Design a binder for this molecule. Structure first.
Ligand SMILES: *[C@@H]1O[C@H](CO)[C@@H](O[C@@H]2O[C@H](CO)[C@@H](O)[C@H](O)[C@H]2NC(C)=O)[C@H](O)[C@H]1NC(C)=O
Ligand SMILES: *[C@@H]1O[C@H](CO)[C@@H](O[C@@H]2O[C@H](CO)[C@@H](O)[C@H](O)[C@H]2NC(C)=O)[C@H](O)[C@H]1NC(C)=O
Ligand SMILES: *[C@@H]1O[C@H](CO)[C@@H](O)[C@H](O)[C@H]1NC(C)=O
Ligand SMILES: [Ca+2]
Ligand SMILES: [Ca+2]
Ligand SMILES: [Ca+2]
Ligand SMILES: [Ca+2]
Lengths: 383, 440, 274, 284
């Protein structure tokens, strides 16, 4: 029988026939609902529960759909892309494709391909004792036909053309802001947006519009929808490992080449394994505040990376907090906002706010001082 | 200003003199004779290499390749590990019959189903049978054998079943190929004429991997367990809610699993480390070894290691990893009493003569990278007949009519009327009429 | 050769070089810094400070290439499970006598520890030029690279401080540089007379004398009152005597650090444990 | 560590000790190493190899170690032989000159089986656990109180074990059914398969079946039971690149010329029934 969801069953029918209660010539049996042999053009749609009528519309993440006769009809909606450089070495391209590098040089994170549009670099370098403990040390931006070089160091102290600058600093082409003294947010008129986090460990988030699909090259991939050609070198063929592809984007010819590391830090530092587990396992505890986000974003990858970072680095608490604060940013981007998740784990500085200041979770850009209201429309970048 | 043939496209933002540039091989070289790199290998100018259907050339430190569309491949293996046509790994543990691939995507010409059943006590499930619907014929791969069902009367879409190495290969003249290792592994290969016209657990094969989680009703989801649950066949089958964690539910089996599966990361596979990332195979090995807790757990491990050795062979690294104490293989069992012709070929790179290819019949894919035991037929009867696994003379091999082998001389069965048939003493099947009314 | 530690925070590397590092937190007693694969690692854990004279050890962690042994004052744990000593695995032997606990490995590792203060480790010749723990390297050079690496003559305290292990739950303060005390040479005659007695005849050619008496120098003045801190060195001297191949006599008198056992059992030196 | 055999029985010349360790989670234990004391020499069979220890200065009682098929064979000129399959199986063979002059877990070799439960203090008991517990070497070792039942503690593994082990009773071994009673071997197979529940349980089963096949060979029934899907064996691994000289001999009934026997050296027993791969050296 055809049952309003599994259509064309009869074409694959490996059985002979007998008696019973059946449906008329047409009017495939209703499966999603509970009625009888209703016509075909009444099939109610479903989407994780709720029973949608034939004509009720919905808007999914990047597309909008309408319940036609039994099957959705969907249409794409614009939605931008995001590359992320997190932890000491964890790069998420514009199309997923997570991998770990552990580099030591300047690298070309992402630059417009045309000839001049822009360039975004980043200093990955050894950070602790061994070569297997790296950090991001400095972000360099080359804009305005590569006629302006801006530098962000991991102590604040943003500087333009080898000269210290004062914030906020708005110009015709781009602008920079510093809303909370631990986050520097840059907007570029071309369609690039940058977030730099300065504590507990330097990180970088880059967002691009959807009108630059396939016109970007660097460690963040090509941003074309396929995550298999992301390792496609600038000279044709595709690589296999994560280090082989990365070495081809060095900004200084003098740097050496690195190789992958086939080991787990949780096996070399035994004394740290119990500590790393006891805390990073909180991500899977449904009763814990992170348990709320389980509906939206799966925590498995974040848990594995939490164990990796906590075992590897030598400031175990700092890496723990840096890893645990990446989940509470991905989740806070899909609506669910984790309120008061700093009550047990990383409350080391929650109570240290100055005289009238308090730790807030929704401190956006335009909650600023009196002068921000004096203009109120000069610096309220969106997105 | 110091270029290096690897920072050519970088830009030199932040030894050799002006002009010549470092090549990484030694002395300084001009830009024209600048070499190329690929998978940690350094090729000089004017070289040649192949990538899975094409051929390339190092021209000016840059690769120039032909543009032909390779086939599409979906992989099912282990305790529910899936790789779609566009390269998106994932996991799913169901207990029902699921649509692996099909063409009835919203009228269609085929369908390939699978049968997953529990194997273990931790809740994981694995494939144990396959069904292939072609037109009206239904093949079924089951119990280490192929069974034909509902063979259509007179259409009989041309297919071909044979056995290569340890694998069973079923090809269709239309452009479908199924490779089955007889335990749990399955490879589905499709010709580039099906591009963007299929749907199922293997994605829709359109060179775009952000929409392979399309459910049965043409909706794009973000959850594995919702994409998987919508392709079950019987509506009464239950729905999966969570992915089990074997090594956590069987703590006492972890120590063994993490020690045997560590060979992938050892020096034995040192050649293949720069060409295939071993981590997603080490994870599968450990995941499988913790779950086979009801018997025969030395078989879950050898297949897991073979899955990676096969890829290493496929990329150009023939590795010999079996030893009398580690997953031994018993080949000479097939030999005559004490004449030695069957040999274990570690990476199958051998092209010999069968009685199919002797008559011009040829396949459409290169399956020259499958592990197993292979013949080395002697020089007094050097034609390998497949349906009996026998080295015979070029005259006495068979006829191979309607996907059924018939010995020379044997009266060939015929589903026609008044048409008798015989395999001649020259490997030729010939038929005559009988006027017992009917005529020639 | 043998690395050893005993007494009031007295240490001895594979190449002599007796010094005193009164660390208390946690340290890397020995390891295999071959670089490619770490065969073994012995980690020592001092106590919180028992008293002025004694210096005990809380527990010992010992990993050999696949498994960890955790030895405490009362029990021994293998791979997280309590084992009833002795144990006879095909690559590892653990035995618990009354006076010692011994561990033998097929890799060429022998560990002997009395549950209070004295610990000694023996390696084969395979691990030369690879050891990197607090016992220094095993190249056979007398204080060559252990203390003079890049021309700077490392003081014992700073050399010991570098060998710490960071436990990511507790912060422990390193000991501060103590004011250089006077060279306790006023008690040299007592130490020499006690150590070079009759019971130690057939080891005057097996083990040297200068280091062990220099150790007695500080021990005698740093440990006023009870002689619980001087007779813990001659015990080490006797253990070295017995281990080389010699046989000492009896020296413990009823007034010189005597010991008691139940029944008519007689305390001796150099007698078969069987 | 238990005394397998010795003649320091109430002054003796040898002793053979065994070392049992747990293998599984049901409490059962299996042998994993062997120690052989002869005069003053001490051999140790361990980790698939023989290691010499405390080799005496000038006595060095003549002994010989070699490898036959899959087994390792040690023979002493005084009349002792030990055959070890390198995993768990051990056969101790003694000359007839040692009759009624031994004690230990193997009885006293006196052609009388109602007194073999003689404890260390020359008492005859009726309980297995009392006779066993008296031959331990270290006093601190615990005492066994009960014999666990593997297939009862692991119910989910029974169905598989009772299915694979049934080959002993199948038609494959029809020739041997009238020459060896299979029941005590079927029980051993089932008991072992239910217990190897921590890894590599396809190695507990093949040895169990091989033990019975070896006896079938020994009594005159050479049976070929290995198949590419059931306990395969990989012999041609030893061959030179592609010259075929090593062959799997199902029941070892082949005598060829080694460079020991070429000089008159001979053993004192027949080991022509040991399974394995054998050479077929060429004529040059
Ligand atoms: C390999 O692919 C070719 C391409 O189709 C197959 O050739 C087809 O064969 C069938 C019947 O033999 C014909 O009806 C088609 O017209 C052929 N195609 C073309 C383009 O002519 C060939 O059969 C395939 N290989 C095998 C072994 O089937
Ligand atoms: C087989 O048994 C005989 C009988 O003893 C062994 O022959 C002895 O050899 C040793 C030294 O090789 C002599 O000291 C004995 O006197 C011999 N015995 C007799 C009765 O003469 C023979 O060695 C044994 N086989 C092997 C391989 O050792
Ligand atoms: C290194 O060589 C051997 C071991 O390799 C060792 O005995 C020797 O003392 C070492 N010498 C140096 C200079 O490291
Ligand atoms: Ca891409
Ligand atoms: Ca797709
Ligand atoms: Ca030295
Ligand atoms: Ca008896």
């Amino acid at each position: 029988m055809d049952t309003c969801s599994h259509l064309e069953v009869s074409s694959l029918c490996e059985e002979h026939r007998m008696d019973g209660c059946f449906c008329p010539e047409g009017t495939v049996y209703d499966d999603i609902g509970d009625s009888g042999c209703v016509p075909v053009s009444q099939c109610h749609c479903r989407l994780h529960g709720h029973l949608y009528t034939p004509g009720q519309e919905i808007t999914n993440d990047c597309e909008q759909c309408v319940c036609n006769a039994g099957r959705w009809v969907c249409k794409d909606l614009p939605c931008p892309g995001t590359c992320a450089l997190e932890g000491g070495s964890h790069i998420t391209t514009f199309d997923g494709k997570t991998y770990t590098f552990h580099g030591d040089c300047y690298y070309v994170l992402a630059k417009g391909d045309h000839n001049d549009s822009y360039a975004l670099l980043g200093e990955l370098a050894p950070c602790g004792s061994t070569d297997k403990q790296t950090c991001l040390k400095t972000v360099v931006l080359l804009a305005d036909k590569k006629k302006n070089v801006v530098v962000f160091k991991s102590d604040g102290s943003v500087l333009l053309n080898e000269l210290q600058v004062n914030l906020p600093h708005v110009t015709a082409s781009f602008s920079v802001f510093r809303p909370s003294s631990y986050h520097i947010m840059v907007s570029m008129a071309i369609g690039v947006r940058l977030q730099v986090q300065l504590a507990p460990v330097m990180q970088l988030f880059v967002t691009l519009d959807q009108a630059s699909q396939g016109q970007v090259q660097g460690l963040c991939g090509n941003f074309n929808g396929l995550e298999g050609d992301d390792f496609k070198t600038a000279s044709g063929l595709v690589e296999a490992t994560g280090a082989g592809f990365a070495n081809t984007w060095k900004a200084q010819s003098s740097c050496h080449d690195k190789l992958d590391w086939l080991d787990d830090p949780c096996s070399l530092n035994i004394e740290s394994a119990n500590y790393a587990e006891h805390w990073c396992s909180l991500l899977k505890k449904t009763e814990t505040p992170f348990g709320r986000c389980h509906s939206a974003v799966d925590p498995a990858e974040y848990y594995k990376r939490c164990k990796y970072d906590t075992c590897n680095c030598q400031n175990n608490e700092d890496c723990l907090c840096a890893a645990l604060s990446s989940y509470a940013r991905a989740c806070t981007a899909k609506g669910v906002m984790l309120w008061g998740w700093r009550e047990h784990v990383c409350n080391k500085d929650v109570g240290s706010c100055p005289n009238s200041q308090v730790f807030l979770y929704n401190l956006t850009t335009c909650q600023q001082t009196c002068r921000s209201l004096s203009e109120a429309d000069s610096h309220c970048l969106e997105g | 200003r110091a270029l290096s043939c690897q920072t050519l496209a970088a830009g030199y933002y932040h030894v050799c003199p002006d002009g010549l540039m470092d090549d990484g091989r030694g002395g300084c070289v001009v830009e024209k004779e600048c070499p190329c790199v690929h998978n940690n290998d350094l090729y000089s100018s004017g070289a040649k290499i192949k990538v899975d259907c094409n051929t390339c050339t190092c021209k000016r430190g840059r690769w120039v390749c032909t543009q032909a569309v390779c086939h599409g491949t979906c992989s099912i293996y282990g305790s529910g590990h899936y790789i779609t046509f566009d390269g998106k790994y994932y996991d799913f543990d169901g207990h029902c019959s699921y649509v692996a691939v099909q063409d009835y995507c919203g009228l269609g010409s085929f369908s390939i189903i699978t049968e997953n059943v529990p194997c273990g006590t931790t809740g994981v499930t694995c494939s144990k049978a396959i069904k292939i619907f072609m037109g009206r014929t239904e093949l079924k791969l089951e119990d280490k054998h192929r069974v034909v069902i509902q063979r259509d009367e007179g259409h009989h879409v041309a297919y071909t079943t044979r056995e290569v190495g340890q694998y069973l290969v079923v090809e269709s003249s239309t452009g479908i190929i199924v490779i089955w290792d007889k335990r749990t592994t399955v490879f589905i290969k499709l010709a580039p004429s099906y591009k963007g016209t299929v749907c199922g657990l293997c994605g829709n094969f359109d060179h775009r991997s952000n929409n392979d989680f399309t459910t049965r009703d043409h909706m794009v989801v973000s959850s594995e367990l919702d994409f998987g649950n919508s392709w079950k066949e019987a509506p009464t089958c239950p729905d999966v809610s969570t992915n089990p964690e074997p090594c956590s539910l069987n703590p006492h089996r972890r120590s063994w699993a993490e020690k045997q599966c560590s060979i992938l990361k050892s020096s034995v596979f040192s050649i293949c480390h720069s060409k295939v990332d071993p981590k997603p195979f080490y994870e599968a090995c450990v995941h499988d070894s913790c779950s086979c807790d009801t018997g025969g757990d030395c078989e879950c491990f050898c297949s897991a290691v073979a899955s990676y050795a096969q890829e290493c062979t496929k990329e150009g690294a023939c590795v010999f990893w079996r030893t009398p104490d580690l997953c031994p293989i018993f080949c000479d069992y097939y030999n005559p009493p004490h004449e030695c012709e069957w040999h274990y070929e570690p990476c199958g790179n051998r092209s010999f003569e069968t009685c199919r290819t002797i008559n011009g019949i040829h396949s459409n894919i290169s399956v020259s990278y499958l592990e197993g035991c292979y013949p080395r037929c002697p020089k007094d009867r050097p034609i390998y007949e497949e349906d009996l696994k026998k080295c015979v003379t070029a005259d006495k091999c068979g006829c191979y009519v309607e996907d059924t082998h018939y010995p020379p001389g044997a009266s060939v069965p015929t589903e026609e009327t008044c048409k008798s048939c015989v395999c001649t003493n020259s490997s030729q099947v010939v038929c005559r009429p009988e006027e017992g009314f009917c005529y020639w | 050769n043998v690395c050893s530690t005993w007494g009031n925070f007295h240490y001895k590397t594979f190449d002599g070089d007796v010094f005193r590092f009164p660390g208390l937190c946690d340290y890397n007693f020995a390891s295999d810094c071959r670089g490619s694969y770490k065969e073994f690692a012995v980690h020592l854990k001092r106590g919180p400070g028992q008293a002025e004279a004694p210096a005990g050890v809380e527990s010992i962690l010992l990993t050999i290439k696949d498994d960890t042994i955790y030895l405490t004052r009362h029990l021994a744990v293998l791979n997280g499970a309590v084992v009833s000593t002795p144990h006879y695995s095909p690559g590892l032997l653990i035995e618990k006598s009354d006076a010692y606990t011994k561990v033998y490995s097929r890799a060429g590792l022998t560990l002997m520890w009395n549950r209070e203060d004295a610990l000694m480790l023996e390696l084969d010749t395979k691990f030369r030029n690879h050891t990197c723990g607090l016992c220094g390297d095993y190249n056979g050079l007398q204080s060559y690279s252990e203390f003079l690496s890049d021309g700077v003559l490392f003081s014992p305290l700073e050399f010991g401080n570098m060998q710490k292990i960071n436990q990511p739950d507790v912060v422990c303060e390193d000991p501060e540089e103590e004011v250089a005390p006077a060279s306790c040479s006023e008690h040299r005659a007592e130490c020499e007379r006690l150590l070079t007695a009759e019971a130690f005849a057939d080891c005057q050619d097996l083990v040297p004398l200068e280091p062990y008496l220099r150790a007695c120098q500080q021990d005698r003045c740093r440990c006023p009152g009870g002689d619980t801190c001087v007779c813990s060195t001659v015990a080490e001297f006797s253990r070295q005597c017995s281990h080389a191949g010699g046989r000492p006599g009896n020296w413990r008198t009823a007034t010189l650090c005597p010991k008691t056992c139940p029944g008519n059992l007689v305390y001796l030196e150099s007698g078969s444990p069987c």
